């Protein structure tokens, strides 16, 4: 993996993070408070990094050499550099919302949220427990343990070939689609944390990639790195077409689905389905007249097989 | 935090 | 409309707003954090005004002359002056809760909430899009467009005569009741935003004023400019009378209804009905034993016609 | 009761509270923001004490001698001293989570939450209205009024003998169990506020102590001074055993129950039952397959009698 | 934010 | 504030 994490690199990273903070306090950006909110995320990430350092008082050599922590720190440093490049190389299109540069800052925001979530899953309370992480579906737990043991983080290639023995991937293009879905921190590493998220979202394990095919790859309602405010904004054009709906990953309850939909009374509501898989929510909502037109489209996929 | 409401009626 | 908005007037307004802030940090007031909270509202309003100015860097002449923005700024300035008068001309009855002066500060609070909401609807992201605002019910959309085109804001008189051609108003007293309901920012102007709120609340459009007659004008459960904390406080006297209920506009989800009710287990709960109009919620809740005694009264209106 | 409350003692108390605040800002502790959060609680308690003092401007002699306020201030001072002792006499086991010292700081946190809640119930808006407090169940209201009149706070002994005439307590050990449940502020005084909480939780009044026997004393799912984050953490080991459940008092909606449960899709969800007593929620959840194994145990109590 | 709970049972 | 969700399905 990347290099060992010393004090010099943590104090560089914070200085990068504080630069992204200053950039992001531009009033022309019109940043709204809702998650994911980069103005809370960077400060919160520093705080959890303070926590880790504090509990590794003495044992810095152990922490500095930890594999996950080295990959994490590199991801964090790379992403905060991408955000600084994005502002600089975007000059004034950062301010026109629905410019590409601006969509790119929202996507980073989400990535900064997914990274903080992963770091807290792996280091709850500032201490490394990647090696005892609990994978939430038992079959998926068995897969990881048989393939990688108690490893916290594995390169994409090695993950893809392990997955491929049990759940065959059809092609190069399907594999790249798969990668973008799972690899929430976008760093070409698959964590036990990102694996947990993906197999909870696309359970049951016994048909994993067919489930991911129907709900994401071939479904017009699925929306990849979208936020709550983006879903609301996207549905506005269908305000007069009750039953229009889209769905995505929840950013604050990672592992759970969030469905957005236009009601018959002129509201745009967002829900998080409980005690039922997305399929069943989608089927029943169609049957009850709520989830009819995915992304405002007139046909809806028949998930009833 | 954002507004998530109960599943539809 | 009012005068053009220059730098001198924005820096006056902020100075007024900061005076209301200082007044409102009196510990004798016992202000609670819940929406609507004047201590978050004024600061937030400044922030969105910072945002607007920032995106009109250069084009101040365009912004300064915008019709809605001129009316807005006047409303904001008038209301912050009323609040300063209220403290000064209230001397020490501001501190006795359930004094009139104190109820008047709560009502202003709500007004400051409704204004901020209108300003964000009309200037989402700091840019003026009153002219493309989406009215949420299609019929109501047609009405506005046929009557006023793409105007953002119209004087009450002109609004009343337009409404009156399609939905006849019975009398002067009914017209004044109507005005107080719709005119959420209390400035004798009806925005496309306030119109949207009113027709979403009292839909369907085809019986608009009968709907507003049954649910507000003649219903003992309707409560005009009340907050969540006021509803809770008002229901306390009926704590031992399960089924007592009141309803009002939600301040944080403008356009939606919030029902307050005393349960059979000694709780006071507040709900926001979804995927059904207030009528249906009221009828079904009566039939299921939840919403029985409006404002603790023994008879309940029969909405089942 | 304890001594009269003067200025000297309030300025001592604040100085103690600010010491607990400094101790609690140690990054090694890894304190999470969720209620109960001692970093918001102490500051908030000071603020409500500022409020009280401010409305008793002049009448300090009246406030200083108020019975409830004297007992409160003593409780607040004793508990903030216990927390300072706990850090000092815990040296470095404060930092190992699931050390005893660390569990003890969580329990104090909860106590600091219960005290602030009691002080706001008795002094809503900074003014003493213990004497008109509304007890939420009518029978329980009658009991208090017949036994103690309009008293705000009564010593445990006197409370136990009053209760004992109407709802006989079986033994010394049952009485001590009863005391720990009711006495939320742990100070050997029972407030009208704590009484209200207990009789709302364990209603109906006509079988009070049998209800408390079945749901708390003999139930393996009941969890005494546990927080939301502790329930989530406790259920992790049962992540693969859907139907495992535990319940407790809600800390932010005192008087209401919060049930934690592992779903069939790999989630840990927490709910607050409404318009039904805990018994009925427990029975129906068992019958629908949600609440099966209390604390992960294979048998579940039959509450259906 | 204030507590809004699901419609009554 | 913590996440409390509607009673189970
Ligand atoms: Ca990754
Ligand atoms: Ca207006
Ligand atoms: Ca007590």
* CATH code of the domain in which C33 resides: 1.20.930.20
Radius of gyration of chain F (CA): 8
Distance CA A290, CA A278 (A): 14
Distance CA D222, CA D245 (A): 9
Name the token pair of A245: 């709906």
The contacts of residue A266 (CB under 8 Å, 6+ apart) are: A239, C136, C137, C200, C203, C255
Elucidation method: X-ray
Residue A116: C-alpha distances to residues A17, A43, A113, C276, D112 (Å): 13, 11, 5, 39, 30
| Count of domains observed in chain D | 3
Answer yes or no: do E6 and F1 touch at CB < 8 A: no
| Structural domain ending residue among the three candidates A190, A218, A246 | A218
Q: Is A126 on the interface with D (CB under 8 A)?
A: yes
Distance CA A78, CA A101 (A): 17
Do D266 and A137 contact (CB within 8 A), yes or no? Answer: yes
Distance CA A128, CA A7 (A): 18
State the distance from the centre of ligand 2 to the C-alpha of C249, rounded, in angstroms: 16
Q: Are residues A149 and A95 in the same domain?
A: no
Q: Are residues D118 and D8 in the same domain?
A: yes
The torsion of the CA quartet D207, D212, D217, D219, rounded to 10 degrees, works out to: 100
C55 annotated ligand-binding residue: no
Q: Are residues C1 and C66 in the same domain?
A: yes
The contacts of residue D207 (CB under 8 Å, 6+ apart) are: none
> Chain B neighbours among A 31-50 (CB < 8 Å)?
34-35
Structure resolution in Å?
2.1
Which of D250, D275, D277, D284 to probe the E interface (max E CBs under 10 A)? Answer: D275
Looking at the DSSP bridge assignments, the partners of residue A153 are A191
Distance CA D197, CA D184 (A): 9
Q: Is A268 on the interface with C (CB under 8 A)?
A: no
A257 φ, ψ (degrees, to nearest 5): -90, 145
Distance CA D199, CA D196 (A): 5
> Chain C neighbours among E 1-9 (CB < 8 Å)?
1-9
- Closest alpha carbon to C239 in A142, A18, D293, D255: D255
Q: C-alpha A71: how far from its chain's center?
A: 17
Domain region containing D74 = 1-129
Distance CA A190, CA C182 (A): 54
The contacts of residue D119 (CB under 8 Å, 6+ apart) are: D45, D48, D72
Name the token pair of D216: 């708390």
Q: Are residues C155 and C226 in the same domain?
A: no
Residue whose tokens read 């925001």:
A109
Can you list the alpha helix ranges (DSSP code H) found in A33-155? Answer: 38-55, 60-65, 67-88, 100-122, 138-148
C228 annotated ligand-binding residue: no
Do C215 and C222 contact (CB within 8 A), yes or no? Answer: yes
The distance between the two most distant Cα atoms of chain B, rounded to a whole number of Å, is 23
Domain containing residue C251: CATH number: 3.30.505.10
Residues in chain E: 9
Pairing of strands A153-155, A257-262: unpaired
Name the token pair of C66: 């915008």
Which protein residues have their CB within 5 A of the ion that is ligand 3?
Answer: D 183, 185, 187, 189
Q: Are residues C13 and C99 in the same domain?
A: yes
Q: Which three-class secondary structure state does DSSP give residue C276?
A: coil
In C, minimum Cα distance to A270 occurs at: C274
Distance CA A130, CA A157 (A): 20
Distance CA A249, CA A197 (A): 10
Chain F residues with beta carbon closer than 8 angstroms to that of E1: 1
Q: Are residues D231 and D257 in the same domain?
A: yes
For helices D156-166 and D138-148, give the axis angle rounded to 10 degrees.
120
The contacts of residue C12 (CB under 8 Å, 6+ apart) are: C77
D294 φ, ψ (degrees, to nearest 5): -70, 125
Q: Are residues C232 and C243 in the same domain?
A: yes
C116 φ, ψ (degrees, to nearest 5): -60, -45
Chain F residues with beta carbon closer than 8 angstroms to that of B6: 6
Residue whose tokens read 């905060």:
A80
- Closest alpha carbon to A194 in A235, A150, A154: A154
Q: Is A125 left (phi over 0), alpha (psi -120 to 50) or beta?
A: left
Do F8 and D290 contact (CB within 8 A), yes or no? Answer: yes
Name the token pair of D130: 């213990």
A245 φ, ψ (degrees, to nearest 5): -150, 155
Pairing of strands A268-271, A257-262: antiparallel
Answer yes or no: do C267 and D50 touch at CB < 8 A: no
Q: Which residue in D27, D263, D264 is closest to A50 by CB distance? A: D27
Answer yes or no: do D54 and C239 touch at CB < 8 A: no
Do C5 and C69 contact (CB within 8 A), yes or no? Answer: yes
Q: Which sign, positive or negative, has the C-alpha torsion D12, D16, D21, D26? A: positive
Edge-to-edge order in the sheet of strand A244-249: A268-271, A257-262, A244-249, A293-294
Q: Are residues A186 and A252 in the same domain?
A: no
State the distance from the centre of ligand 2 to the C-alpha of C30, rounded, in angstroms: 29
> Chain E neighbours among D 254-273 (CB < 8 Å)?
272
Looking at the DSSP bridge assignments, the partners of residue A245 are A261, A294
Do D166 and D205 contact (CB within 8 A), yes or no? Answer: no
| Structural domain ending residue among the three candidates D129, D146, D173 | D129
Looking at the DSSP bridge assignments, the partners of residue C293 are C244
Answer yes or no: do D272 and E3 touch at CB < 8 A: no
Burial class of C111 by CB neighbour count within 10 A (0 to 12, 13 to 18, 19+): buried
The torsion of the CA quartet A271, A274, A279, A284, rounded to 10 degrees, works out to: -70
In E, minimum Cα distance to D272 occurs at: E5
Q: Are residues D102 and D4 in the same domain?
A: yes
Looking at the DSSP bridge assignments, the partners of residue D260 are D246, D270
Q: Can you give C66-98 as a three-state secondary structure string? A: CHHHHHHHHHHHHHHHHHHHHHHCCCCCCCCCC
Q: Are residues A259 and A184 in the same domain?
A: no
Distance CA D286, CA D281 (A): 8
Number of neighbouring beta carbons within 10 Å of residue A253: 15
Chain C residues with beta carbon closer than 8 angstroms to that of A95: 55
Q: Is A243 left (phi over 0), alpha (psi -120 to 50) or beta?
A: left
Distance CA D118, CA C80 (A): 36
A165 annotated ligand-binding residue: no
A187 annotated ligand-binding residue: yes
Answer yes or no: do D276 and E9 touch at CB < 8 A: yes
Q: Are residues C112 and C148 in the same domain?
A: no
- Closest alpha carbon to C193 in C109, C248, C119: C119
Name the token pair of A286: 């169609």
Do D231 and D259 contact (CB within 8 A), yes or no? Answer: no
Name the token pair of A194: 């990102």
Do D281 and D257 contact (CB within 8 A), yes or no? Answer: yes
Ligand found nearest the CA of A188: 1
Q: Are residues C153 and C210 in the same domain?
A: yes
| Structural domain ending residue among the three candidates C218, C248, C282 | C218
Q: Is C252 on the interface with E (CB under 8 A)?
A: yes
Do B8 and A275 contact (CB within 8 A), yes or no? Answer: no
Q: Which three-class secondary structure state does DSSP give residue A260?
A: strand
Do D270 and D228 contact (CB within 8 A), yes or no? Answer: yes
Long-range pairs, D237-243, Cβ under 8 A, ≥24: D237/D296, D238/D262, D238/D293, D238/D296, D239/A134, D239/A136, D239/D266, D239/D268, D240/A138, D240/A141, D241/D293, D241/D296, D243/D289, D243/D290, D243/D291, D243/D292, D243/D293
Q: C-alpha C51: how far from its chain's center?
A: 23
Number of neighbouring beta carbons within 10 Å of residue C257: 21
Q: Which three-class secondary structure state does DSSP give residue D261?
A: strand
Domain containing residue C144: CATH number: 1.10.238.10
Chain E residues with beta carbon closer than 8 angstroms to that of B6: 6-7
């Amino acid at each position: 993996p990347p290099g060992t994490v010393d004090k010099k690199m943590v104090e560089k990273c914070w200085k990068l993070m504080d630069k992204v903070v200053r950039l992001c306090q531009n009033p022309k950006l019109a940043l709204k408070n809702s998650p994911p909110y980069i103005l809370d995320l960077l400060p919160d990430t520093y705080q959890h990094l303070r926590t880790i350092l504090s509990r590794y008082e003495g044992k810095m050599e152990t922490l500095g050499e930890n594999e996950y922590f080295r990959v994490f720190m590199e991801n964090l440093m790379k992403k905060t550099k991408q955000t600084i490049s994005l502002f600089k190389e975007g000059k004034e299109r950062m301010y026109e919302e629905n410019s590409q540069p601006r969509r790119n800052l929202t996507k980073l925001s989400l990535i900064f949220s997914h990274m903080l979530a992963e770091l807290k899953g792996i280091f709850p309370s500032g201490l490394f427990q990647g090696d005892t992480f609990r994978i939430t579906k038992a079959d998926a737990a068995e897969f990881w343990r048989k393939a990688f043991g108690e490893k916290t983080i594995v390169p994409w290639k090695s993950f893809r070939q392990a997955l491929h023995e049990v759940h065959p991937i059809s092609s190069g293009l399907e594999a790249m689609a798969l990668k973008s879905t799972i690899d929430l921190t976008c760093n070409d590493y698959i964590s036990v944390f990102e694996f947990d998220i993906f197999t909870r979202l696309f359970q049951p394990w016994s048909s994993l990639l067919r489930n991911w095919n129907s709900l994401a790859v071939t479904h017009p309602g699925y929306m990849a790195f979208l936020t709550y405010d983006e879903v609301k904004a996207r549905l506005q054009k269908f305000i007069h077409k009750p039953g229009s709906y889209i769905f995505r990953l929840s950013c604050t309850r990672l592992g759970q689905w969030a469905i957005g939909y236009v009601t018959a009374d002129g509201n745009i509501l967002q829900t998080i389905p409980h005690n039922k898989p997305l399929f069943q929510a989608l089927i029943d909502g169609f049957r009850e007249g709520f989830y009819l037109f995915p992304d405002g489209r007139n046909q809806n996929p028949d998930l009833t097989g | 935090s954002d507004g998530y409401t109960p599943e539809p009626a």
